[model samples]
Target: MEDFVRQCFNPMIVELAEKAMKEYGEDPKIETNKFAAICTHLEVCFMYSDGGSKHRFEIIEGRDRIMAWTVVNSICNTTGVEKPKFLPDLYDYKENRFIEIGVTRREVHIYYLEKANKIKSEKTHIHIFSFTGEEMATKADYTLDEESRARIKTRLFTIRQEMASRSLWDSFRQSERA
Candidate 1:
């Protein structure tokens, strides 16, 4: 797992963070170190959770934990009966600040890039929250602008194409081997 983090996870996460910061008009270079520290902490959290302890879900706090939880939920594939086996390979990066995924029938995990609060603060902060099925219907918290909506649509289309091509290639490989 440590190797995975150093080689794959860390780089991918940092790239995503950079992309997200750029979208929000923030200087990624200025905040790169801070995000690097978070990545280290996140690796520790991942190790702890992988041990299968009772408090696996309670190991981290605040916005960083939101990213951890979403990744864990994706690996666990816990979308529940209604959408069982619907593994969402794509991440929803909307509002230039959030990474969201449907984790369960009644829950959607959200990781906010900035503080969810309106107050102005110098300290960097991230927030993680979940919306229950009921709240999802009534609450107006998750709104996306037109640009974000279009990006998501494009992402979904690309993923579909990739999956189709991957399966086709796999079948060809198996036939060649046989």
Candidate 2:
């Protein structure tokens, strides 16, 4: 589990974090504690091993749940599979946090939603804390419409079907070898 977390899960989180920072017009250097917060927000469901055969990958519940399509897309990247079209807009759910990285005196701070609410809502904004209990940064959230939400849901279903087919094929091949 530790190896998987470091090798696979950590890379995925860093990639996503960098992507978010770039999108938010910030440098892509995520602080350690920021990475920890994101890790705490997203939980690992399964580790795909034996060339995607041993265990099937699935998204599990966490404090701030990651979208299924996002997780699937990341796996596809790591496995060198073709990414699906119709990728949905992120932050499409109230539970989702709009990640924003801020820099202060050469230190990086990650800002995100602390509670569940629409991004446009005034109550959704929050202040984050550092590992030492110092106040970090203020959050700036984003909004997602109903159409985007529907598309995200559809994309998640599509990715799940793809994952299921791939897992079935890999399992069959492994059994044949056994």
Candidate 3:
């Protein structure tokens, strides 16, 4: 978020997410499956920023396609398939910190959400650490304590809520309600 956080809010991050979600899924509010309260949502990973190169991550069981695009989109603001109509820092939902990720085509970064539409597929949305967020493709890391982790986790939860408020991802269809 170094070079662009200043303008990221203009077009809005949620709108960018909507564009990413639409790339592979019919709806923007899809979710993966979980047996425990500590389950995750994305299944793959990548990096963005400084020396920036398109980093293709290992495909997690649940994450294979759409999420892959999300990583790319969130980082570079480029839709995985086409020229992004939206350009904002794609919310790095799982990791509270910022990092660039995904593969590049032409000049656009593409964050693909692996197995985007499957409920139990995407697991890449888990909390990431400073090693991956700051030093993975660069030279920085944050050795945070339990309190820091707890605070960040709570912040992440709030971010999730804000993201949902923008898209209502988990709401049931009431199109035919009235």
Candidate 4:
């Protein structure tokens, strides 16, 4: 039976799906407004700030845009559901004052580059909260500039393409390739 299944479906596809889903699916989206909040959330406020600077969600999203942060807490249990930590920094910045921009649980798992699209990604993440039994794709209220919005969507598509990869399983088994 095992051999039959492998023969019919590509092993790499199975491996990648399992890796992507296991790493990304078990977690729920957490909400965050500012990266500055994490130090206080973790009791390291003084190390990063004096509480005199303003912690703003500016540019991370419009004031009314919903924020998603469950990616980390789902794996590390380090934040609140209603008020998780924000990347605040753009998705691809290194040495981010925002923190956790590129960090993750496993070598394969990574923080969603909320700002990844500035380089090659998007400013909004597609939420499953609106998935329906129809062909229409539900989207967030994107009031940000059009260029930014497209980047975000592109980044999302890139990630989903990875999640839905068929060669993923074979990559997992080899361990030397991932």
Off by over 4 Å in 2: 1-9, 30-32, 44-178
Error of 4 at 85 (Å): 17
Model 3, position 73, has a per-residue lDDT of 53
Higher-lDDT candidate of 2 and 3? 2
lDDT of 2 by residue, 99-146 (tens): 222111121242333222223333222332222223343343213333
- Sorting all predicted structures by TM-score, with the top scorer first, yields 1, 3, 2, 4
Worst 10 residues of 4 by lDDT: 129-138
* Candidate 4 ranges with C-alpha deviation above 4 Å: 1-141, 167-178
TM-scores for the candidates: 0.24, 0.24, 0.24, 0.21
Write the residue-wise lDDT of candidate 3 on 1-178 in tens digits.
1112112222333344344455656343332111101111121121121112222222221233567456545544532332233222223333332332322111111112221222122222222322112112212232234454444345335434543555532331111111
RMSDs, each prediction?
A: 18.7, 19.1, 15.0, 17.4
lDDT of each: 0.33, 0.32, 0.29, 0.26
Candidate with better TM-score, 3 vs 4:
3
Note the residue pairs that clash in candidate 2. Answer: none
